[PDB]
Symmetry: D2
Subunit: 208 residues, 4 copies
């Protein structure tokens, strides 16, 4: 049993992206006898696809859990659906702002996450971790990777389960926002890290 | 040097009020050679005034820092001003919903907090704790106690410094909110507790 | 040329649903030589499908624009995608709260709206009407009807264009919310009505 | 009977300030036999005080209703209190960003609005206009003028009634916000104008 967990590098002016640390922290750990691999993806259209594809082919995970930062969200959110479209509100890290373009021409308009999202949400709640089901992962890089992963699963037969989890800003990221007149929600890094570990465990238990 | 820190009991249907634990956790601790006293106040008009007054007279603190829960707020908020008015959106724990009534007839319309609010905010930021200055503590029990404390200071000469700090819900309080279709912001209990300790230290350092 | 515009009856405790009046106000009007039909749909799973299907078969519109109330949204929102799923946060008007169930088993995971959404948004902006593209119509009755309409189009060949538009609460609906301690955004009924008329005109101009 | 209504010029990068039009639209009208005067104030500390003072001395209104734009607010808000402090989050139109400074050294920490705020709110509700009582007018120019007007009343004996009303953005102001990734609430200019007229009528009826 192999699990791939991905995070993203900093973007949009932020100095950090908590999911980058999540990926690095979880890389190499084991849950039961399952091996976990953690990889960081660039917040760049095209390049992110290449890295994602190469990583999936290299590791051939049974489960893929892609994690990303969702500025403004107040709790862990588990994405229900990936959409075959790109409509960036802001450019990627290479200055590319793609508008109204499919991710994979001719492929399905959307794919449902194959992670046991409701069970994951329920377990998180039991652990005292606020979490809910999101019905839109946006149309930026998070959705981009989510869709490509699910498309890979439908086309290659692996990973068996694939999904996306968005996390709030961590507290330290809020500091310089205060002066800018606005205080978005945040969640401790420790809680977010534990949330991802829980998602992995629940996904694994769901498998065979 | 004596410091009084107060918290509130649960209210509005909530099973807990994190500031109650804060008061109990801080009671009896010492910062430098300063003695800290922690007391829990009832979320009841009239009764809260009695307890507050008796506590202030009993301990005669040099510094009073009153803490309360502010449902929906995303970061620590330091109250700048206390208003001589009661206009409860919800009833107190005794079912009393007082509307448009002064707290102390004939007394000043308002009192500015005498805690070094900007310095406290700055120190919190340096510690990676999101915090900002609130210009309204509401017109429920938090403002009620804040005003009475400052009025006590102006009338009795002590405490020398008095102010109010509102804290967000802690994560576990968000769980049953999710089903109700809504996810308010939260902050770890550990961070909130540390924030109050920091406020006390900064206030003390400001003193003499 | 025939255009079908639908609205919904009141739901969730609300005394009114502004889209009900929209449908009635637009029923029978003509834009150019195009005939407009306005119909109100029940906020009930199953029954809404029956009414929708019968209405589409009866009128056989070239364009279908389904309108609904989106509590909390601050501007007109044009739905980009319909999802093949039902996961009601609240029950329908018959007390039915369907969770994780496809709308049409075996049908596509999703359908993109075939209305010229970007052009509609642009025209609204030119008219001084705030509007944006929504990437999730929720998974309640709005999405339910949106999906069924698009599925009807893909399966029957008509309507040629189909989409959904969500509108904010109108001001009078906010009044009793104030006491409940919360003030959601609102938009005048006149502006919302004009927005729908504009969407129809833009859709028609896009046709042949 | 004379009524003074003031509005503010554009500020903070905005091309317009709806309260400027309100002041101009209401200038010269009569409600019953009461004469209404409308004046626009600069969003500049110091200068705004001069204009306000000269205007009050020139007209000597019995009632003064100062109106301002409150970006982000979703409904009409009637200010309950003016605070003797300036702490600008942004600079004024002259680039002056005053921090922690009293408006009138030695004067009261605050003044309660003398407009019949609850009656005004109630009448607005009856007219289907969302409105609520705000407990902080901020510490920028709105609060600045509100405090000075009330101080003038307490010191000079006129106006007999003075208060402040904040209004949301009007729809056209939201357009360029959408691209910036964010959609604040708005209210039609017509409703805002009517709200101010209602406030004036209620204030007048309250007088003698």
């Amino acid at each position: 049993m192999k699990v791939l967990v991905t995070g993203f590098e900093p973007f949009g002016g932020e100095k950090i992206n908590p999911t980058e640390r999540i990926a690095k922290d979880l890389d190499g750990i084991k849950i039961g006898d399952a091996q976990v691999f953690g990889r960081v993806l660039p917040v760049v259209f095209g390049k992110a696809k290449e890295v994602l594809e190469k990583t999936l082919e290299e590791i051939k995970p049974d489960i893929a859990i892609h994690v990303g930062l969702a500025p403004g969200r107040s709790a862990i959110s588990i994405e229900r659906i990936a959409v075959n479209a790109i409509d960036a509100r802001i450019p990627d890290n290479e200055g590319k702002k793609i508008e109204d373009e499919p991710i994979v021409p001719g492929a399905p308009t959307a794919y449902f996450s194959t992670l046991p999202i409701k069970k994951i949400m329920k377990k998180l709640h039991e652990r005292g971790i606020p979490a809910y089901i999101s019905n839109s992962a946006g149309l930026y890089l998070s959705n981009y990777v989510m869709y490509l992963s699910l498309h890979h699963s439908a086309t290659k037969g692996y990973p068996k389960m694939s999904g996306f989890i968005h996390v709030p800003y961590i507290p330290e990221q809020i500091i310089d926002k205060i002066g800018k007149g606005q205080v978005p929600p945040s969640m401790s890094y420790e809680m977010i890290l534990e949330a991802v570990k829980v998602a992995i465990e629940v996904a694994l238990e769901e498998l065979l």
